[PDB]
């Protein structure tokens, strides 16, 4: 039972539902593809996001837009959580909220092939 | 309740037959045997199963099934108890001849007219 | 708690054609006990009684 | 895009990826044999969470000769332009939420399929 | 006037912001000081963060990407025209900095999700012929199966045989 | 439930299941084998050292990698088995009566892999090809069911049941 | 002998309505009702009709 003004209007109740509902990457992720991109500036894929920000592999975990808007998330908190949960061992280069594709770039810095598979799973 | 059952007045159970005449009749046609066949040729083909035994491969189900149906209608090589399956979504022809397959007789309708004429 | 399922491949009975979600093809008995019943709806009513 | 298994050339076994630390490139090695070959796809694994599979790729031309499949004349074919044609749902489990039909031309030597 | 800074990181961030604001040549048309605006944005970011940590660098990169995004130059034009004060731009979020089309699409998606999260109301024949004993009101809905009575405002539940 | 034709021996069951969870590791429950064995070791034991042959027997088309990403985990899982002898030893080690020596285990494994499993296809001296093809068809059907491209088989469908009248009962 | 006419008319109207719902679902117009999928809302609408 809602207590605040959210009890009357549904606009301030949807966020309450979203925060009380379990959301994971699987619910917001659409595709996940691993690439063995040698040079981080090389960018085998055509994406104008890396050189502005600046290991021979990365994970391109692109997120869906409709689900992300339904749960009302932002890439900042997603990056913060994905970086803090696994310690200061990776470097997630998030994307701005203006491009059409919600692509991401997860890289590891410091057997190693399957580590990315295990961590993504 | 629901476990004990009784047959219908027309329900009939197949007594059982032998698969050898069917195997011979299907072997005479242009049917490559499963022991000597290119594995890449299985995709665009239909797998024939007789009594649950995968044997042979064919390349023309639409004619093979019609030939089998006509042959069964004529009652010369295949008894009336044998049943030929045609799986359209996946190309598989599963034929069964063992006993216990409950069945019943049904009239045949070619296009829009039955064969049970006044004669 | 649901309509008559597709016991066969995507159809209730062999009489009805595939992908036939019509009322009479899923258990809706249109007739009444005074005016008799269609065999298909008769069978479905037997299913409900069971 | 997707990724295919490429068997070895001598032993004909699976080739696992290997990042060449020396030349800084992607290789596919054999565990049993010592065969090597330079990669060209630059991809190893892709996961489709939404599982956006095109049902048309699974549909075959043989579905037309189905005696227990509905037929309509109001959706003629495109290539040949035949009138008679069949229609049916995905007929596949895991159907997310859609009963969108997949019209298939019912005519020999055409086997065309489309959707409206 | 934004105070000058002797920090190398702050100077680099200010230069990057000024370069990004110069994209499209909107400054010449508007006659706005790109360097001053970049310095003000950097100062506002530094005041908000109070350190040149990873958060400050991420915020600077996000601001540069938003200002240099060719898919919505209206935000950059408004920033260079004084429509968005530098403090507001520095404190603005990604959703607020999005273009008009992107903002409309996000609002439509949020509205659709809010609607879909709802639950369908229980059906019934609403009428005022039955007086609910739990609230004294006349509005209510009935259902024949025995006729179940469901109160509209009070919500009194009863049945009549 | 395999059964040749009213044979002296009872019907044998072959459960080719898959773990839910790496993930997606296919197993098998062969008769007279308490533990589970992956399908790939079984294929190698039937006389298929090459991986391409095993995949061709299992998967008929290689133009669909989406089906193929499912079999890669299990196929990588049992990689320390290439020759036929080690596969026979591995399968015989899980037998109900493990031979004290190696030759007895090999003989037991060969006997269980040529008479106990799938007796209906053939129990003659040279019938490993048809057994391997039947097992590959089984794995293909399992993979299709897992992908959802083909709905599951209903248990109560009388089309998959048989009646035992006075004849078979006596 | 008039109630039969009314019942037949009502049944025909219900059949026409369910056919129209099926046509709309086929051509992708019936939007999913909140809290339910497309098949669930289609079935609920048919049952209510
Ligand atoms: Zn090799
Ligand atoms: Zn055509």
mmCIF file with all atom_site columns, C-alpha atoms in Angstrom, chain E residues 22-113:
data_model
loop_
_atom_site.group_PDB
_atom_site.id
_atom_site.type_symbol
_atom_site.label_atom_id
_atom_site.label_alt_id
_atom_site.label_comp_id
_atom_site.label_asym_id
_atom_site.label_entity_id
_atom_site.label_seq_id
_atom_site.pdbx_PDB_ins_code
_atom_site.Cartn_x
_atom_site.Cartn_y
_atom_site.Cartn_z
_atom_site.occupancy
_atom_site.B_iso_or_equiv
_atom_site.pdbx_formal_charge
_atom_site.auth_seq_id
_atom_site.auth_comp_id
_atom_site.auth_asym_id
_atom_site.auth_atom_id
_atom_site.pdbx_PDB_model_num
ATOM 1  C CA . UNK E 1 22  ? 32.943 24.860 -31.530 1.00 0.00 ? 22  UNK E CA 1
ATOM 2  C CA . UNK E 1 23  ? 31.452 21.946 -33.493 1.00 0.00 ? 23  UNK E CA 1
ATOM 3  C CA . UNK E 1 24  ? 29.005 23.184 -36.122 1.00 0.00 ? 24  UNK E CA 1
ATOM 4  C CA . UNK E 1 25  ? 30.269 26.796 -35.990 1.00 0.00 ? 25  UNK E CA 1
ATOM 5  C CA . UNK E 1 26  ? 27.180 27.823 -34.005 1.00 0.00 ? 26  UNK E CA 1
ATOM 6  C CA . UNK E 1 27  ? 29.332 30.099 -31.825 1.00 0.00 ? 27  UNK E CA 1
ATOM 7  C CA . UNK E 1 28  ? 30.141 32.400 -34.755 1.00 0.00 ? 28  UNK E CA 1
ATOM 8  C CA . UNK E 1 29  ? 26.457 32.689 -35.668 1.00 0.00 ? 29  UNK E CA 1
ATOM 9  C CA . UNK E 1 30  ? 25.486 33.304 -32.031 1.00 0.00 ? 30  UNK E CA 1
ATOM 10 C CA . UNK E 1 31  ? 28.544 35.408 -31.153 1.00 0.00 ? 31  UNK E CA 1
ATOM 11 C CA . UNK E 1 32  ? 29.081 33.532 -27.883 1.00 0.00 ? 32  UNK E CA 1
ATOM 12 C CA . UNK E 1 33  ? 32.454 33.026 -26.206 1.00 0.00 ? 33  UNK E CA 1
ATOM 13 C CA . UNK E 1 34  ? 33.099 29.291 -26.523 1.00 0.00 ? 34  UNK E CA 1
ATOM 14 C CA . UNK E 1 35  ? 36.193 29.426 -24.301 1.00 0.00 ? 35  UNK E CA 1
ATOM 15 C CA . UNK E 1 36  ? 34.350 31.292 -21.538 1.00 0.00 ? 36  UNK E CA 1
ATOM 16 C CA . UNK E 1 37  ? 31.438 28.840 -21.695 1.00 0.00 ? 37  UNK E CA 1
ATOM 17 C CA . UNK E 1 38  ? 33.816 25.881 -21.516 1.00 0.00 ? 38  UNK E CA 1
ATOM 18 C CA . UNK E 1 39  ? 35.652 27.396 -18.558 1.00 0.00 ? 39  UNK E CA 1
ATOM 19 C CA . UNK E 1 40  ? 32.344 28.025 -16.780 1.00 0.00 ? 40  UNK E CA 1
ATOM 20 C CA . UNK E 1 41  ? 31.207 24.447 -17.453 1.00 0.00 ? 41  UNK E CA 1
ATOM 21 C CA . UNK E 1 42  ? 34.503 23.065 -16.141 1.00 0.00 ? 42  UNK E CA 1
ATOM 22 C CA . UNK E 1 43  ? 34.264 25.261 -13.038 1.00 0.00 ? 43  UNK E CA 1
ATOM 23 C CA . UNK E 1 44  ? 30.686 24.130 -12.389 1.00 0.00 ? 44  UNK E CA 1
ATOM 24 C CA . UNK E 1 45  ? 31.709 20.482 -12.796 1.00 0.00 ? 45  UNK E CA 1
ATOM 25 C CA . UNK E 1 46  ? 34.654 20.953 -10.425 1.00 0.00 ? 46  UNK E CA 1
ATOM 26 C CA . UNK E 1 47  ? 32.417 22.656 -7.857  1.00 0.00 ? 47  UNK E CA 1
ATOM 27 C CA . UNK E 1 48  ? 29.883 19.823 -8.113  1.00 0.00 ? 48  UNK E CA 1
ATOM 28 C CA . UNK E 1 49  ? 32.552 17.114 -7.784  1.00 0.00 ? 49  UNK E CA 1
ATOM 29 C CA . UNK E 1 50  ? 35.324 18.840 -5.795  1.00 0.00 ? 50  UNK E CA 1
ATOM 30 C CA . UNK E 1 51  ? 37.981 16.519 -7.226  1.00 0.00 ? 51  UNK E CA 1
ATOM 31 C CA . UNK E 1 52  ? 39.528 15.451 -10.527 1.00 0.00 ? 52  UNK E CA 1
ATOM 32 C CA . UNK E 1 53  ? 38.655 11.797 -9.939  1.00 0.00 ? 53  UNK E CA 1
ATOM 33 C CA . UNK E 1 54  ? 37.170 9.283  -12.382 1.00 0.00 ? 54  UNK E CA 1
ATOM 34 C CA . UNK E 1 55  ? 33.693 10.738 -11.804 1.00 0.00 ? 55  UNK E CA 1
ATOM 35 C CA . UNK E 1 56  ? 34.788 14.195 -12.973 1.00 0.00 ? 56  UNK E CA 1
ATOM 36 C CA . UNK E 1 57  ? 36.433 12.745 -16.087 1.00 0.00 ? 57  UNK E CA 1
ATOM 37 C CA . UNK E 1 58  ? 33.320 10.692 -16.862 1.00 0.00 ? 58  UNK E CA 1
ATOM 38 C CA . UNK E 1 59  ? 31.105 13.766 -16.450 1.00 0.00 ? 59  UNK E CA 1
ATOM 39 C CA . UNK E 1 60  ? 33.385 15.816 -18.716 1.00 0.00 ? 60  UNK E CA 1
ATOM 40 C CA . UNK E 1 61  ? 33.370 13.069 -21.356 1.00 0.00 ? 61  UNK E CA 1
ATOM 41 C CA . UNK E 1 62  ? 29.575 12.779 -21.187 1.00 0.00 ? 62  UNK E CA 1
ATOM 42 C CA . UNK E 1 63  ? 29.181 16.552 -21.538 1.00 0.00 ? 63  UNK E CA 1
ATOM 43 C CA . UNK E 1 64  ? 31.581 16.614 -24.500 1.00 0.00 ? 64  UNK E CA 1
ATOM 44 C CA . UNK E 1 65  ? 29.711 13.761 -26.195 1.00 0.00 ? 65  UNK E CA 1
ATOM 45 C CA . UNK E 1 66  ? 26.329 15.417 -25.610 1.00 0.00 ? 66  UNK E CA 1
ATOM 46 C CA . UNK E 1 67  ? 27.520 18.798 -26.904 1.00 0.00 ? 67  UNK E CA 1
ATOM 47 C CA . UNK E 1 68  ? 29.286 17.232 -29.907 1.00 0.00 ? 68  UNK E CA 1
ATOM 48 C CA . UNK E 1 69  ? 26.392 14.916 -30.826 1.00 0.00 ? 69  UNK E CA 1
ATOM 49 C CA . UNK E 1 70  ? 25.419 15.722 -34.415 1.00 0.00 ? 70  UNK E CA 1
ATOM 50 C CA . UNK E 1 71  ? 22.032 14.015 -33.963 1.00 0.00 ? 71  UNK E CA 1
ATOM 51 C CA . UNK E 1 72  ? 20.724 16.842 -31.725 1.00 0.00 ? 72  UNK E CA 1
ATOM 52 C CA . UNK E 1 73  ? 22.581 20.129 -32.324 1.00 0.00 ? 73  UNK E CA 1
ATOM 53 C CA . UNK E 1 74  ? 19.650 22.042 -30.802 1.00 0.00 ? 74  UNK E CA 1
ATOM 54 C CA . UNK E 1 75  ? 20.990 21.422 -27.291 1.00 0.00 ? 75  UNK E CA 1
ATOM 55 C CA . UNK E 1 76  ? 24.421 22.745 -28.284 1.00 0.00 ? 76  UNK E CA 1
ATOM 56 C CA . UNK E 1 77  ? 22.848 25.795 -29.938 1.00 0.00 ? 77  UNK E CA 1
ATOM 57 C CA . UNK E 1 78  ? 20.763 26.529 -26.835 1.00 0.00 ? 78  UNK E CA 1
ATOM 58 C CA . UNK E 1 79  ? 23.819 26.129 -24.593 1.00 0.00 ? 79  UNK E CA 1
ATOM 59 C CA . UNK E 1 80  ? 25.860 28.476 -26.791 1.00 0.00 ? 80  UNK E CA 1
ATOM 60 C CA . UNK E 1 81  ? 22.908 30.902 -26.933 1.00 0.00 ? 81  UNK E CA 1
ATOM 61 C CA . UNK E 1 82  ? 22.470 31.113 -23.154 1.00 0.00 ? 82  UNK E CA 1
ATOM 62 C CA . UNK E 1 83  ? 19.242 29.092 -23.061 1.00 0.00 ? 83  UNK E CA 1
ATOM 63 C CA . UNK E 1 84  ? 20.915 26.535 -20.773 1.00 0.00 ? 84  UNK E CA 1
ATOM 64 C CA . UNK E 1 85  ? 23.139 28.201 -18.135 1.00 0.00 ? 85  UNK E CA 1
ATOM 65 C CA . UNK E 1 86  ? 26.481 26.415 -17.665 1.00 0.00 ? 86  UNK E CA 1
ATOM 66 C CA . UNK E 1 87  ? 25.543 25.374 -14.122 1.00 0.00 ? 87  UNK E CA 1
ATOM 67 C CA . UNK E 1 88  ? 22.363 23.728 -15.423 1.00 0.00 ? 88  UNK E CA 1
ATOM 68 C CA . UNK E 1 89  ? 24.259 21.978 -18.226 1.00 0.00 ? 89  UNK E CA 1
ATOM 69 C CA . UNK E 1 90  ? 26.887 20.693 -15.787 1.00 0.00 ? 90  UNK E CA 1
ATOM 70 C CA . UNK E 1 91  ? 24.214 19.523 -13.329 1.00 0.00 ? 91  UNK E CA 1
ATOM 71 C CA . UNK E 1 92  ? 21.908 18.221 -16.074 1.00 0.00 ? 92  UNK E CA 1
ATOM 72 C CA . UNK E 1 93  ? 21.467 14.480 -16.555 1.00 0.00 ? 93  UNK E CA 1
ATOM 73 C CA . UNK E 1 94  ? 21.656 12.369 -19.708 1.00 0.00 ? 94  UNK E CA 1
ATOM 74 C CA . UNK E 1 95  ? 17.863 12.244 -20.060 1.00 0.00 ? 95  UNK E CA 1
ATOM 75 C CA . UNK E 1 96  ? 17.541 16.035 -19.873 1.00 0.00 ? 96  UNK E CA 1
ATOM 76 C CA . UNK E 1 97  ? 20.338 16.583 -22.414 1.00 0.00 ? 97  UNK E CA 1
ATOM 77 C CA . UNK E 1 98  ? 18.689 14.293 -24.984 1.00 0.00 ? 98  UNK E CA 1
ATOM 78 C CA . UNK E 1 99  ? 17.232 15.700 -28.189 1.00 0.00 ? 99  UNK E CA 1
ATOM 79 C CA . UNK E 1 100 ? 13.553 16.544 -28.613 1.00 0.00 ? 100 UNK E CA 1
ATOM 80 C CA . UNK E 1 101 ? 12.830 13.409 -30.650 1.00 0.00 ? 101 UNK E CA 1
ATOM 81 C CA . UNK E 1 102 ? 14.743 11.196 -28.209 1.00 0.00 ? 102 UNK E CA 1
ATOM 82 C CA . UNK E 1 103 ? 12.991 12.822 -25.243 1.00 0.00 ? 103 UNK E CA 1
ATOM 83 C CA . UNK E 1 104 ? 9.583  12.299 -26.860 1.00 0.00 ? 104 UNK E CA 1
ATOM 84 C CA . UNK E 1 105 ? 10.405 8.657  -27.618 1.00 0.00 ? 105 UNK E CA 1
ATOM 85 C CA . UNK E 1 106 ? 11.569 8.078  -24.037 1.00 0.00 ? 106 UNK E CA 1
ATOM 86 C CA . UNK E 1 107 ? 8.414  9.711  -22.663 1.00 0.00 ? 107 UNK E CA 1
ATOM 87 C CA . UNK E 1 108 ? 6.227  7.575  -24.936 1.00 0.00 ? 108 UNK E CA 1
ATOM 88 C CA . UNK E 1 109 ? 8.064  4.406  -23.889 1.00 0.00 ? 109 UNK E CA 1
ATOM 89 C CA . UNK E 1 110 ? 7.727  5.320  -20.206 1.00 0.00 ? 110 UNK E CA 1
ATOM 90 C CA . UNK E 1 111 ? 4.004  6.020  -20.624 1.00 0.00 ? 111 UNK E CA 1
ATOM 91 C CA . UNK E 1 112 ? 3.494  2.717  -22.452 1.00 0.00 ? 112 UNK E CA 1
ATOM 92 C CA . UNK E 1 113 ? 5.380  0.832  -19.730 1.00 0.00 ? 113 UNK E CA 1
#
